Amino acid sequence: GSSGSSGMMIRERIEEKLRAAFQPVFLEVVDESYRHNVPAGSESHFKVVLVSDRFTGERFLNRHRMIYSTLAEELSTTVHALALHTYTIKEWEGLQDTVFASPPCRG
């Protein structure tokens, strides 16, 4: 991006970082803008998708510790809670659809 015209959108800052942060295979963030006029200061719906092998059924918390570390403060700035969705290559290969693959075993 040529200098000059730029923005301060969190959604971008988040990904833009992860890109080089881990350099996974998949990346997609779901940001939600203001919907109602009234002031809302209770919760901030936010979700992020990042597929990586590193999440090979290692841990449930370790999935956040790694992410947070990157956007430790970056996110803490305005965002507080986030629903991380770390998946694996396989699981992704057939998240919804599932093929009946049950090969026989050997001695």
From Swiss-Prot:
Q: Which family does it belong to?
A: Belongs to the BolA/IbaG family.
Q: What is this protein called?
A: DNA-binding transcriptional regulator BolA
Q: Gene that codes for this?
A: bolA
What range does the record give for the signal peptide? none
Return the PANTHER family for the record.
BOLA TRANSCRIPTION REGULATOR (PTHR46229), BOLA-LIKE PROTEIN 1 (PTHR46229:SF2)
| GO molecular function (one) | DNA binding
* Gene Ontology terms describing biological process: cell redox homeostasis; DNA-templated transcription; intracellular iron ion homeostasis; iron-sulfur cluster assembly
Can you name the source organism?
Answer: Escherichia coli (strain K12)
Q: Which UniProt keywords apply?
A: Activator, DNA-binding, Repressor, Stress response, Transcription, Transcription regulation
Induction of its expression: Induced during the transition to the stationary phase, under the control of the sigma factor RpoS. Also induced during early logarithmic growth in response to several forms of stress (heat shock, acidic stress, oxidative stress, carbon-starvation stress and osmotic shock), and this induction can be partially RpoS independent.
